[PDB]
Amino acid sequence: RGYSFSLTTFSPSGKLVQIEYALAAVAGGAPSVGIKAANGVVLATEKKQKSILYDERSVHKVEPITKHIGLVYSGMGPDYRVLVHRARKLAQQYYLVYQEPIPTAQLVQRVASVMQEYTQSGGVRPFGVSLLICGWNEGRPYLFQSDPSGAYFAWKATAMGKNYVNGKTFLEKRYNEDLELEDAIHTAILTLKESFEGQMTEDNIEVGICNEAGFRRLTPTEVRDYL
Amino acid sequence: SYDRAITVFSPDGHLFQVEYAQEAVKKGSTAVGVRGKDIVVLGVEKKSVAKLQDERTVRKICALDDNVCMAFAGLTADARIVINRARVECQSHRLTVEDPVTVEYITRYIASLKQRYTQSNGRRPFGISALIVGFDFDGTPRLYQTDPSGTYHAWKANAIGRGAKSVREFLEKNYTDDAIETDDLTIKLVIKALLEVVQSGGKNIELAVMRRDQPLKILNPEEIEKYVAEIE
């Protein structure tokens, strides 16, 4: 059947604890860094399974929603798969009516709506993942962040997951307005190197970039050279 | 969809949910009602009489039809839902029967919908009381009162909301066959009843009369100030 009552309710102080607990799950996940830089946007993440038995090429953290929109997350892995599938269907639906690539801002709004529906619906818990969407439309780069509550903010450079506050300080005093995509990756990986514990390789991180040509997921070769 | 039983019986044969709905009606503004001979009056106390608030958007007296009007006490949000459902029934009654609805017919409908919410799944009872006042086809003034439980009774003069008991006792000793003799007399009895349960009555009272063969008439502050001077 399924429960028809809200699992997330207001507390006496006016807080939606369920959403607050979902943000705590997002704050313990692998660190993610998003950087918008003049000619493009870069999204990097710590894709370290640390066991040497797992296939590094199998799973993927940075996913392409459309040809110009990329996605990255922080929190729960399986929850991200649901949102990525929803984001891909939302982009297709929009393109079936308007016959034109869905704008980055329109997709974030549509995808944030889905996340807000799990905070008020019956018998469900809020998504335990924070997304870092990036896109390129109308000759301009975009970087949005959609948290578990359903709220979205437009950023220039941000970081989620473990040590996000520490990365926001190292990002607030190392990021410049007039920055190029190629140089944006260097400061995106450097921000991820300030909380990477062990040794960073080409199979320990995943980087996706967005520009005029469209969203792309950097291959191991590219990353290696950058490292 | 939600199908939980909200209102249920208790050890002493009580219906707590309905009792809490009546508790919300006691915290509402006082709404007085007095049935006259050729005029029905309605008085409503204005607690939050802020000077920066359009008073026409926050009234307790509404008109369901051209011969029926009502006042309430309790949760304002619920009153609106009940008031609009009753308005659709007045229009529905006019479409099925040539004549307009009688005061009792619409009161019965309003009370029946309230009882419906106290016995169905997934819903909670309405937290408001109503004083339906109007005139029938015969010209007989009418006054009924519905409550959260769903029971309604005809009255000669009644009050609801906070301090309704104090006003009800004042009407019992003051409502005779001479106090409602004239138009002004009946209107002055309603303003006097609200003066015992209000602070500096005269600028915090909003009343509307309903004469025979005439639509709802809300007396503005100036007119209410003239009546307070005669009660001094």
Binding site: - | P11, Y152, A154, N158, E172
Partner: protein, 231 residues
Amino acid sequence: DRGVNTFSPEGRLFQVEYAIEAIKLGSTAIGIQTSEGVCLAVEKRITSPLMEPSSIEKIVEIDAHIGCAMSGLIADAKTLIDKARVETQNHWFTYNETMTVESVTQAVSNLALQFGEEDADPGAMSRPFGVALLFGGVDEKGPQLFHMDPSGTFVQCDARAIGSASEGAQSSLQEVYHKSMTLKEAIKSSLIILKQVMEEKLNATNIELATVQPGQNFHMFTKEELEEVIK
């Protein structure tokens, strides 16, 4: 906390047991069945002099040959009274004949236990009706008085009293009622018993009596009629 359809350790539905306890707070209604018609009388119980006593309808008309006196939560009885009215109207449309008193009581007793949370529809009861009914009518078997409570059990009785002061009234009917008592004798007995168990001095505007005779139809005593038997 428990559900609405929960049995107690003694084998009783909690909800129904609490609904039967809610009928002990309602007004009293004494019904006496005779050979020359049935008589129903209820205690109006007005709580204010401003309150119009003509708006209190404890005794209603189900049909020309059937009457009804209720006690307990009066608001809940408006749904049962309409079912009975539609049931007797439906019977006439299909068989061109009046429904019997026991048949009308059976159709109203079927809804008594029709309630529940799970596996239910939008227009489903959430609890039982906390009210008791006294059906009095005249069919092919003559005068008949029936009693139906919250559990859904309808039985026949020569004399019944339901309400707050039922225990005291029931005993006063056990030694003042016989099989050969007239309809006029029954009306006085009921009034006398009602006056004793009531708090306010019985008068023409306090109570409400109704009668259903073989050759006649359902009839509600007016002020004049009531006064006659009051003195």
